[PDB]
């Protein structure tokens, strides 16, 4: 009904399908495209409910802020009472942790950890970006590792998880150097506020480390030639982007570099799928 769409509006059903597809992606790579409908269904829904829980627990803590910032949303627009939402988040979470027991121990561990981070980020680490950047980096990388841990060969997914964590956390800092003026006025603590271009040296450091781990699926004789070529074009571009921002550390370059890194991050994800297709 019309009341149902309000609940689908709260959980952000599109964003959840997106994270769940990211979950199945990790499962495909790990099983080498050898799918089991029963394991595929658990992976799609554990990621869906944990994501639905994160999205719901965020709207609860941001109700006082969304009465200004983002109005017309289910909670600040009276559509759902605060207690209706609180009861709902408990249910979505119980499903996420129970369904993961049916995958294995590691899947339950990743689910519990995601859940703790999702609550802590929504509660306090959202406007304290030094810890909050890592939370976004880890939570993004973890959706692949989820499906990956359900598979027979998790080694290529572990490289994908680590590389995602490092390049997203790094990009988050580059993003906070572009957002420095709006952050300071809002009373938000970030690395480019606490330090100068020094934060952009640490941003470079993660981008570099991820680039060192990236040729490992080839080195470990897991992925083929196509992976190695795709990763070589991107590894060079990743370091080139960072080198340009260190040259001109201003708002405009931080903006352009942030956009480019989003592209060459997708080309790397594609490279992992292409590498897995070639069995």
């Amino acid at each position: 009904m019309e009341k149902l769409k309000t609940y689908l509006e709260l959980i952000r059903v599109k964003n959840c399908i997106t994270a769940s597809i990211g979950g199945i992606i990790g499962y495909l790579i790990s099983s080498n495209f050898e799918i089991d409908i029963l394991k595929s269904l658990l992976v799609f829904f554990v990621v869906f409910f944990v994501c639905a829980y994160g999205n719901v627990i965020n709207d609860i803590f941001d109700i006082e802020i969304d009465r200004i910032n983002k109005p017309s949303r289910p909670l600040p627009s009276g559509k759902i009472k605060l207690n209706e939402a609180k009861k709902f988040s408990a249910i979505l979470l119980i499903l996420g942790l129970v369904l993961s027991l049916f995958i294995n121990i590691y899947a339950l561990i990743i689910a519990v950890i995601n859940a703790l981070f999702l609550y802590l980020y929504a509660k306090k680490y959202k406007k304290y970006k030094p810890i909050g950047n890592f939370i976004i980096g880890y939570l993004t990388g973890s959706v692949f590792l989820f499906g990956g841990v359900a598979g027979k060969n998790v080694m290529p997914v572990v490289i994908l998880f680590l590389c995602s964590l490092l390049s997203i956390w790094g990009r988050e800092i580059v993003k906070d150097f572009e957002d420095m003026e709006g952050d300071k006025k809002e009373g938000v603590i970030s690395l480019p506020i606490k330090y100068g271009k020094k934060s952009l040296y640490f941003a470079t450091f993660l981008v570099v480390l991820a680039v060192i781990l990236s040729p490992l699926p080839y080195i470990l004789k897991i992925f083929g030639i196509w992976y190695l070529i795709l990763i070589a074009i991107c590894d060079i571009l990743f370091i080139y982007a960072m080198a340009l921002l260190l040259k001109e550390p201003n708002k405009e370059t931080a903006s352009k570099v942030s956009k480019f890194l989003k592209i060459i991050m997708n080309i790397v994800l594609l490279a992992f799928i292409v590498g897995a297709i070639k069995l």
Side-chain angles (χ1 to χ4, degrees), residues 6-257:
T6 302
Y7 280 87
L8 285 162
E9 209 208 305
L10 181 74
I11 62 139
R12 297 190 214 249
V13 66
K14 210 163 176 187
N15 195 267
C16 291
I17 294 169
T18 297
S20 297
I21 291 309
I24 294 169
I25 275 151
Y27 179 61
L28 283 150
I29 301 157
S30 196
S31 71
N32 295 99
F33 281 83
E34 287 168 84
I35 291 283
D36 169 24
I37 323 102
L38 288 137
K39 275 205 120 84
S40 279
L41 272 149
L42 283 163
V43 170
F44 191 88
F45 283 109
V46 184
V47 180
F48 183 91
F49 293 130
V50 155
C51 196
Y53 158 76
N55 269 280
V56 167
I57 200 93
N58 183 66
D59 287 30
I60 285 153
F61 287 114
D62 282 57
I63 194 166
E64 309 278 71
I65 320 299
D66 283 327
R67 279 187 233 273
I68 302 104
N69 293 27
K70 205 174 178 184
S72 85
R73 280 217 55 84
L75 275 165
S77 80
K79 289 204 215 83
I80 277 164
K81 271 194 190 284
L82 195 82
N83 307 294
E84 288 183 67
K86 280 161 150 184
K87 290 176 233 161
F88 183 41
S89 73
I91 295 305
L92 295 157
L93 170 82
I94 292 153
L95 292 153
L97 307 172
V98 165
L99 288 150
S100 64
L101 305 163
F102 296 92
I103 293 148
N104 47 64
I105 188 69
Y106 318 100
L108 166 72
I109 293 148
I110 303 151
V112 168
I113 300 314
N114 286 9
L116 287 154
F117 275 133
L118 295 174
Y119 178 94
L120 282 164
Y121 179 80
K123 197 189 200 285
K124 58 197 276 186
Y125 301 108
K126 207 164 90 142
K127 54 193 293 170
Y128 185 73
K129 270 152 177 178
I131 293 165
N133 295 329
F134 166 74
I135 288 176
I136 304 148
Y138 165 80
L139 282 168
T140 306
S142 83
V143 306
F144 310 111
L145 187 53
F146 217 118
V149 114
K152 62 178 180 186
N153 182 38
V154 69
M155 194 41 66
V157 189
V158 173
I159 312 297
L160 179 58
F161 160 79
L162 240 3
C163 294
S164 283
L165 195 152
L166 298 167
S167 64
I168 293 143
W169 178 13
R171 191 191 172 262
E172 280 302 304
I173 307 151
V174 165
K175 252 186 156 187
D176 292 358
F177 191 88
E178 180 200 344
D179 280 332
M180 257 201 289
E181 275 287 285
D183 280 345
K184 244 181 178 182
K185 294 163 194 175
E186 293 177 350
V188 163
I189 313 108
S190 68
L191 292 184
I193 283 170
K194 292 180 79 74
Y195 326 106
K197 77 174 185 293
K198 293 179 179 179
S199 56
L200 307 178
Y201 278 105
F202 179 76
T204 303
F205 176 70
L206 308 161
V207 171
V208 171
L209 223 179
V211 162
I212 302 177
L213 306 181
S214 64
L216 284 161
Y218 185 80
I219 298 152
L220 295 174
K221 297 197 193 290
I222 315 170
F223 287 158
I225 177 158
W226 316 119
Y227 176 81
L228 189 68
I229 306 310
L230 264 150
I231 291 305
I233 304 142
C234 297
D235 278 0
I236 289 168
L237 290 165
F238 261 103
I239 308 310
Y240 176 70
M242 293 302 112
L244 287 180
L245 182 56
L246 300 160
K247 275 176 200 157
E248 199 175 83
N250 57 351
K251 197 218 160 180
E252 54 163 340
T253 294
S255 176
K256 187 255 172 283
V257 167

